[PDB]
Write a protein that binds this ligand. Structure first.
Ligand SMILES: *[C@@H]1O[C@H](CO)[C@@H](O[C@@H]2O[C@H](CO)[C@@H](O[C@@H]3O[C@H](CO)[C@@H](O)[C@H](O)[C@@H]3O)[C@H](O)[C@H]2NC(C)=O)[C@H](O)[C@H]1NC(C)=O
Ligand SMILES: *[C@@H]1O[C@H](CO)[C@@H](O)[C@H](O)[C@H]1NC(C)=O
Ligand SMILES: *[C@@H]1O[C@H](CO)[C@@H](O)[C@H](O)[C@H]1NC(C)=O
Ligand SMILES: *[C@@H]1O[C@H](CO)[C@@H](O)[C@H](O)[C@H]1NC(C)=O
Ligand SMILES: *[C@@H]1O[C@H](CO)[C@@H](O)[C@H](O)[C@H]1NC(C)=O
Ligand SMILES: *[C@@H]1O[C@H](CO)[C@@H](O)[C@H](O)[C@H]1NC(C)=O
Ligand SMILES: *[C@@H]1O[C@H](CO)[C@@H](O)[C@H](O)[C@H]1NC(C)=O
Ligand SMILES: *[C@@H]1O[C@H](CO)[C@@H](O)[C@H](O)[C@H]1NC(C)=O
Ligand SMILES: *[C@@H]1O[C@H](CO)[C@@H](O)[C@H](O)[C@H]1NC(C)=O
Ligand SMILES: *[C@@H]1O[C@H](CO)[C@@H](O)[C@H](O)[C@H]1NC(C)=O
Ligand SMILES: *[C@@H]1O[C@H](CO)[C@@H](O)[C@H](O)[C@H]1NC(C)=O
Ligand SMILES: *[C@@H]1O[C@H](CO)[C@@H](O)[C@H](O)[C@H]1NC(C)=O
Lengths: 434, 176, 123, 431, 123, 434, 123
């Protein structure tokens, strides 16, 4: 029984490392630079301690997404000359009254000493008046606006996070996993499938669903200060569009630099509205509330209210379908009381100057999309925030929250975990080296 | 085999196709393999054809993979097939130049006869379908004639010509 | 072929049977740097294990029994039960606090073996 | 018979990889990054299949030169403020009539709230008028001009393209190598020879002369759309100069940002020209005709005509002579008809705001008089498609695709990847 | 002495004499990253071959004998015309459609030989 | 006899490698990006030749410091719109009269077509008049001014220079080592002792002291053109302060642009000065002259005078501490002629527009630091320069020189040297492989 | 234990006993790329020496005895003076100008031994 050496033994230790991307038109997330993907191995009698809220993959993905977002904004047009006094008037070709502003401003041409008086349409959320009236862009006193490249697409292309050689990613396949604790059924896949870098709040769009029933995953179900990632088993399809027939007009800011204005509108002016099947949403809410009654008691009243308040990005459901950023008002979704063919319409609002990652001093102007935008997605999860109670009430109010994109991407990298292999193993065995 | 129709004076945009979406060297030639236009790296070179002063390609479109052939001031003799050689293909389109007009420019009276003149390219079979505001949708061969001319017969007649399921609208001068 | 680390729940005999696949999988713009440094990290991590194997006299051998005895206890147990039911992960957990000493003993034993062989080869 | 493993056997496969530079004070082609150069081993009894027109090395060198030029231009001055209205008049201090324009504009001084009235001589090909008339920079409504830093030089310095470890570069020494097919004499070199990355059209300059006779290499000689790269054996010298005694005047267009602009032409105004020995050029064209008749027949009339037309960089022999970008009208060179002391002068034109062969870059004026002598080591001819019934083959100078200039120097080379792991049967058996 | 790839046209037996010449040449802004990535690629490509040699029981060897029989399906040529007339390039071309099978066979033969070895040493 | 290959022999050769950094708000040297540190192993019996004048580490650290300085100024504000015509007037609220200028200028605003008449306090060394008078920024006709980011601190944080794997760093431990020649006491330490990258002239501040005796180190002690790096054995602490109570005022010069200009001084205006103990400095000068006599004869008259002339950086003791760059006239320190409670006050002048590395076309604007700055530092050495003697005079005059930062960093990297391990060796013995 | 380079002053016979200590330390934004290229450079420098060891038939062995005769033209001193008086530094300084021919001799001898072994095993 002398010390013997074994190489290639299957032993791992939890550790953090840099994971590259593999992806099966350019995008803000450079999937073209990712390696071409190709492999699933089951692990018998293994018990692995997972933790969705201490997973380093979430922070790594958030940093990578931010870096890819602000990298693609570097070679694009910089809209510094746009920060001028805009003489704006109401469009007047309707509930979208005043929400489309007709603004004219002095403008530089290819010659430095020649001025030009051009016009462009700006949404009311994109301009703030200065005390026809004088207006300026909403982000002329905080951030430098950098117009997004017209060719670069914002479409979420799936990416796969493959660990480097000598590392493995353990994928828990338990169908009743609350995000924390040992997972008695683990697998081992070198990459991560079904990862879509979608940006949204209060509604996880185009995500990966649960397997059998709606999962309530929270770090602290008792502490109300933490979010509650709900995940759906059956998708709730969302239908919505921008009925306005927009026209994109190119205005020169200077030599070889075009500012794609909003031009003019063709047809009638209609509010951007998001539609969810009322029966589908009601059934999904019933299933979800049945799930929450598990952690709060059967005789506990569950109440759903709209967002409490704050920034428009966290107050309203804000996605980016079609290249135009929506800020849909979800007050008509979470409004009910639960006691033990028609479609709900959501009055969205549209912005163009966006500061996605709550970054101070860096914003982006989204070029208007020509034609009519229609996007169909389906909600695979919610981000609810239980309000603080008085600990003596029967009702519990769950208002959608969010704002932390990491909380969105934690709904996908919850089942994975990166480990470092220790293939060198010492043990006793009846050998003696001659 | 794509076919397009001209109007004897306007421009025509015959487009090559590139699968690599990049600046692949291409060359436009007619049926006699006489070079007309061509990419050379990032610059443009024109072949020793009869379209020296007319042929042109939108240099800004070459990056996306579109290599058009703009032919300004179309002429009746310019009707021929043209070939792309983007990578190894023979993307071939045919250009037909139709010239339709009338001999009686302005000198006309009431109750007289009107005659048209269609100049079809050699080696083609056109079909003229005239249209008039009063409703004489005259059908006939290459040459069309009108026997009634009155004050009611004013207005521009959008007489368009058909060949191989392709139709091109014209305009005519009628002042009474 | 239980798979890459597939035998992690199997017996240590079964794992020692399938060490080769684990041995062969240890080597093979925002994404550009994460790709390059991942490759560098993988290469250096594999080379560290190879070098540690080399200075113990176990180069190129997946299994290499050595002369260093089982000093003290080090959770000795017995050879029968350890390789019949116990899994590799638990075993690594038990002796995680004596690994450096074991490595040092192996290094010194290999150096002694090389010196003795060089001494006896000159006779 | 048992399987035996051999590691380190002479076996290679065609592959594409990243080859780094090894050059032999700042240059647009980096000299502070290329590893210092350090060799040739003949390979008997080997025949390797080469291919010029599908070689990855030319594409990689093209990308490298583009990246070097676009990287050495970033820390340079930006000339967006030059986009103003230029009140311009003709200079009158004979051939250069109305070709040098005496513009004068309003430009911002080092202070943001003060203006300065300065004047500069702009070439005719560099200003387009707006209907003393008002002008503007030619590349002002579609691209931003960044002046080339005067402290960096466009001097073509030879660079050696070395293959990384584990790869080898095969060099075909067959002196009658036409660019495609098996090469019966292949040699291995650590790095390629000195490759002067000259930028030129219609006339390969400064290249490596071919031995034996004037070799003609084409991707498909029968096709009338493939550049017929010609390589000489006896170089014909070309003497290009700009007689103007130019002087450089510095304008402050911003804090710490200068703009070197043409000032006053001291002395007479004369046209930039190039001289080629008429007898030597006639002999070289005769040799090219003799070697070209082999591919089209002996009785076919070989005719040379000037460029058919297009952009100025294709229709004229353009090159960099010491900093100033010439554009020489070679109509007097390719003008002959071949059937079975005096110097030719080419009237060249000089542009400052040139369009890069990739955005435009402004070459600052060079102080003094420029003269340079170069070797014409090859042409780039493009055949004119025939009607199949005529016995004449008119060749016109092409070029413009800068990959063809570097394909006349990377023709003998080929990158291979060494695969040293081999297996073969022997009677041996492990104990 | 011939030099790098000097015996590339020589016969198989004659070219097998100079394995070290091709063996020791397998390891050694815009140009900076091209240098760094090329170095990493060369290191990885050398380590790949070294690991393939290691899992065949041929680690640290240039000419390594194995225990896998040579099936006549891959090549029916005899030793005389293999080692006396053909060139290593031709041999690589002939068996290039069977290399994966031979590599896998070497792998399994090596692992069975190893496991038989630890079975023997347990006595 | 037969050759035998020994692997891992203690054999090294002189070499140059790319040493990396390691150290224990965001800093200007980006010491956070360095790998955390943790060491010394004595090398008996060995003799190694050291040469600090041919030490590649001083050049490597010079390049590294320059690159770190230039890298942290990229994301900072570019003060191009500051280059305007200033209408300055004298400030009046002692001897600081005609030193601070009250400059009022036209500055752009968030809106491009709007202006803003702001005012600021610029020091007399920051402005040159144009020929109330009209001034302008001093580095306006030669360089582009880039204001340093206010959240980036110029504090000298200790950094360690660790050689990569396969290389070793030798450390000369001879207590009387004169920077050239063999060191009979060498040690191998992986990471340097921790070099504070302090930029200064005429006085090596916060440096590492000698062990036994004040060491005089020169490349050629007989050559007058080579500086004479002095190193003290005991520190001479220097008390530097800026009595003016500065008030920082933010001026918006564009979208997301924040120019920080001096406001109104709260209180009285006084000259910033550096206090040095007179008795301590006299004793230290006595020790320096005592040891320096060993290289010029015991009957030599050693004299100290003020600087010869040149730019303000080399004429006066320039140093940065607290964020405000001082330039201390040091004629009060070097005035003595040495033959065989009170304090010294050095008047200092403060600049804001700095060009630290003598580079043409690049400058920095150090934003004002709020409040009164008090700054305590050690004087651990000088950088003297011997003037050209007449070869027949008994008096030797030394004037403080410097200006080459490599001289400052050569006083810390003097005992260090990087070697390359050659572990492969061949030696004959009676072996024979069987 | 003397530590890294601890026996740099000790004699050859005494410094040849701690070769493992100097062997295990041979492998393990302005600062980021410097760290990365330092890692890559260390890996290359270790791998070239390991390849040199493995080419002479000494892979994985610190003290390998080989068949190349010690030519007296390199050093005429006896073993009593070499292994008991001089340390490794002056020895490396002494024969630093004869090392390439020694490396070539070792390479050729190892290749010859490999071919001889393969020929012997075929009987
Ligand atoms: C969730 O996934 C759906 C399905 O992929 C997304 O809808 C898709 O959105 C893209 C982007 O606009 C559409 O592609 C575009 O189509 C138009 C023509 O309609 C074309 O002109 C554009 O160039 C572009 O190709 C795509 O048609 C559409 N698919 C469907 C079935 O509607 C949706 O945007 C995703 N939601 C989120 C929040 O990412
Ligand atoms: C334009 O819209 C604003 C916002 O509702 C409103 O206050 C204003 O009265 C409108 N102007 C006119 C002329 O109706
Ligand atoms: C999650 O589940 C584990 C065991 O399944 C349990 O120990 C833990 O308390 C649970 N936590 C939450 C927040 O549900
Ligand atoms: C809706 O969810 C289903 C569930 O698998 C999925 O197949 C579908 O792709 C989702 N919708 C969209 C637009 O992706
Ligand atoms: C200048 O030269 C141009 C070019 O020939 C000519 O048209 C013009 O009349 C000349 N004179 C002036 C005043 O432009
Ligand atoms: C070109 O100039 C060189 C140097 O003055 C001279 O030797 C050569 O003969 C000239 N050739 C021609 C054609 O002018
Ligand atoms: C080439 O082949 C001939 C013919 O057998 C042979 O004599 C010669 O040695 C070979 N050369 C090489 C380098 O293998
Ligand atoms: C400011 O004070 C200095 C001190 O001498 C004086 O020379 C200068 O004229 C003063 N400036 C004004 C505007 O009074
Ligand atoms: C410097 O200031 C310190 C206070 O921090 C004081 O203790 C010391 O005595 C002062 N020294 C001199 C020389 O003024
Ligand atoms: C020297 O160090 C002290 C304390 O660490 C600090 O207050 C002072 O600013 C430093 N001096 C310089 C010039 O960095
Ligand atoms: C020069 O030295 C003398 C010594 O008597 C001293 O009085 C004087 O102040 C010094 N000059 C200075 C400090 O400027
Ligand atoms: C140093 O040398 C002396 C005399 O040669 C010897 O006695 C001693 O052991 C040596 N020490 C070391 C550490 O080599």
């Amino acid at each position: 029984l002398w010390v013997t050496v074994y190489y290639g033994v299957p032993v791992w230790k939890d550790a953090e490392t840099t994971l590259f991307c593999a992806s099966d038109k350019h995008n803000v997330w450079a999937t073209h630079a990712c390696v071409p993907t190709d492999q699933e191995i089951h692990l018998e009698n293994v018990t692995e301690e997972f933790n969705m809220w201490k997973n380093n993959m979430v922070e790594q993905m958030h940093t990578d997404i931010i870096s890819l977002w602000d990298q693609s904004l570097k070679p694009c047009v910089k809209l510094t000359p746009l920060c001028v006094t805009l003489q704006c008037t109401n469009v007047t070709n309707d509930d979208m009254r005043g929400e489309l502003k007709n603004c004219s401003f002095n403008m530089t041409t290819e010659l430095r000493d020649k001025k030009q008086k051009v016009y462009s349409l700006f949404y009311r959320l994109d301009v703030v008046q200065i005390n026809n009236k004088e207006y300026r862009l909403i982000n002329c006193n905080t951030s430098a606006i950098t117009q997004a490249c017209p060719k670069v697409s914002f479409e979420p292309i799936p990416i796969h996070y493959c660990a480097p050689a000598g590392f493995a990613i353990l994928k828990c396949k338990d169908k009743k996993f609350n995000g924390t604790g040992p997972c008695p059924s683990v697998s081992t896949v070198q990459c991560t499938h079904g990862i879509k870098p979608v940006v949204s709040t209060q509604l996880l769009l185009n995500g990966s669903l649960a397997e059998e029933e709606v999962m309530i995953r929270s770090e602290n179900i008792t502490n109300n200060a933490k979010n509650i990632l709900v995940q759906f088993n059956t998708p709730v399809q969302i239908n919505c569009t921008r009925p306005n027939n927009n026209t994109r007009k190119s205005i020169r800011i200077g030599p070889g630099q075009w500012f794609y204005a909003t031009g003019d509108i063709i047809g009638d002016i209609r509010q951007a509205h998001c539609n969810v099947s009322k029966a589908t949403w009601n059934e999904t809410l019933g299933k979800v509330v049945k799930q929450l009654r598990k952690h709060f008691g059967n005789n506990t009243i569950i109440r759903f209210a709209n967002s409490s308040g704050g920034r428009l990005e966290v107050t309203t459901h804000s996605f980016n379908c079609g290249g135009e950023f929506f800020y849909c008002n979800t007050s008509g979704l979470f409004n009910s009381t639960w006691i033990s063919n028609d479609s709900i319409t959501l009055p969205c609002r549209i912005k163009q100057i966006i500061n996605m990652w709550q970054r101070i001093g860096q914003a982006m102007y989204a070029p208007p999309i020509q034609g009519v935008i229609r996007c169909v997605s389906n909600i695979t999860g919610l981000i609810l925030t239980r309000d603080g109670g008085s600990t003596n009430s029967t009702t519990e109010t769950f208002r959608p929250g969010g704002g932390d994109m990491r909380d969105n991407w934690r709904s996908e990298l919850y089942k994975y975990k990166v480990v470092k292999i220790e293939p060198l193993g010492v043990a006793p065995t009846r050998c003696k080296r001659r | 085999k794509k076919v397009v129709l001209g109007k004897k004076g306007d421009t025509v945009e015959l487009t090559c196709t590139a699968s690599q979406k990049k600046s692949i060297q291409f060359h436009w030639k007619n049926s006699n393999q006489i070079k007309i236009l061509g990419n050379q790296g990032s610059f443009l070179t024109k072949g020793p054809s009869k379209l020296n002063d007319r042929a042109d390609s939108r240099r800004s479109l070459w990056d996306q993979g579109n290599f058009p052939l703009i032919i300004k001031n179309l002429k009746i003799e310019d009707s021929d097939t043209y070939i792309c050689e983007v990578e190894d293909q023979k993307e071939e389109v045919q250009l037909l130049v139709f010239g339709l007009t009338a001999n009686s420019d302005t000198h006309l009276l009431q109750g007289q006869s009107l005659t048209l003149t269609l100049e079809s390219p050699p080696g083609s079979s056109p079909s003229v379908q005239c249209r008039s505001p009063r409703g004489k949708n005259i059908q006939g061969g290459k040459t069309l004639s009108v026997s009634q001319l009155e004050l009611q017969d004013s207005g521009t007649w959008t007489c368009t010509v058909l060949q191989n399921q392709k139709k091109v609208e014209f305009k005519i001068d009628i002042v009474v | 072929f239980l798979g890459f680390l597939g035998a992690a729940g199997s017996t240590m005999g079964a794992a020692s049977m399938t060490l080769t696949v684990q041995a062969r999988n240890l080597l093979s713009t925002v994404w550009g740097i994460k790709q390059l440094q991942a490759r560098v990290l993988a290469v250096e991590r594999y080379l560290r294990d190879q070098q540690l194997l080399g200075i113990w006299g176990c180069s190129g051998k997946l299994i290499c029994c050595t002369n260093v005895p089982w000093n003290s206890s080090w959770s000795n147990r017995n050879l029968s039960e350890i390789w019949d039911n116990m899994t590799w992960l638990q075993w690594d957990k038990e002796i995680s606090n004596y690994t450096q000493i074991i490595y040092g003993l192996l290094e010194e034993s290999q150096n002694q073996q090389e010196k003795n062989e060089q001494d006896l080869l000159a006779l």
